[PDB]
Design a protein around this ligand. Structure first.
Ligand SMILES: CC(C)[C@H](Nc1nc(Nc2cccc(CN)c2)c2ccccc2n1)C(=O)O
Length: 228
């Protein structure tokens, strides 16, 4: 997260750290008892590395009563995802057992109504991604509030030049933004999961290259199918 602040420990009990070989790789969001939603590009190149999900965490390094590392029974990228496209960038991780719930571990309700958020809606994005241009990695969860940017602005030739489909949404990226290590994480608007961070457009903090987020509601039937 660029331009953000340290999040209140455990105040987003849905937040997950997707880990590769014991290091944070991507964000994710607990959406069901046994399933975490993240981005397909996160595992594009993971090959047979050890993929785990850390729930209940604020600090990546320090012990906390609610922090538990889960193994992954199955990783389900969206079948239409591809390296080098921006579209369909969702991944569902089935934990090896149901998560133990509590005040610091809870699934986030997610948007099934397929309609756009109002322009400027202030949505919350959190993550353990880099926090400056040098690439510093924070130990603890960071977050920023970002206003939703209407799709027409986002599709201007000066911006993303027509690449924002109805299944994607944007948020402003003026210095405050999601960044590397934040993909897969949640864009939460009005207390409900609306979007998943994507890296499809990799630059961070350039206002003319808004954040892109995958609209969960657009993929409701796919999420439901895989969950069940
Ligand atoms: C592992 C994922 C596929 C993803 N990769 C990734 N993402 C970058 N950027 C990025 C990530 C999330 C969000 C956005 C834009 N708002 C921009 C980035 C930038 C510079 C060089 C390599 C970069 N690798 C990530 O780390 O989330």
């Amino acid at each position: 997260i660029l331009g953000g602040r340290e999040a209140e420990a455990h105040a987003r009990p849905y937040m997950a750290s997707v880990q590769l070989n014991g290091a944070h790789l991507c964000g994710g969001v607990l959406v069901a008892e046994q399933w975490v939603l993240s981005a397909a590009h996160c595992l594009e190149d993971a090959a047979d590395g050890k993929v785990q999900v850390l729930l209940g965490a604020h600090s990546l390094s320090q012990p906390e009563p609610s922090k538990r590392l889960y193994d992954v029974l199955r990783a389900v990228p969206h079948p239409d995802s591809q390296p080098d496209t921006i579209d369909h960038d969702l991944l569902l991780l089935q934990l090896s057992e149901k998560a133990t719930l509590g005040p610091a571990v809870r699934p986030l309700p997610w948007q099934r109504v397929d309609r756009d958020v109002a322009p400027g809606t202030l949505c919350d994005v959190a993550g353990w991604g880099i926090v400056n241009h040098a690439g510093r990695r924070p130990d603890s969860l960071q977050h920023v509030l970002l206003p939703v940017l209407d799709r027409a602005t986002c599709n201007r030739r000066t911006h993303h030049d027509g690449a924002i489909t109805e299944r994607l949404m944007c948020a402003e990226s003026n210095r405050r933004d999601s960044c590397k290590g934040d993909s897969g994480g949640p864009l939460v608007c009005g207390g409900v999961l609306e979007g998943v961070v994507t890296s499809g457009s990799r630059v961070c903090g350039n206002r003319k290259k808004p954040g892109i987020y995958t609209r969960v509601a657009s993929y409701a039937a796919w999420i439901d199918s895989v969950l069940a």
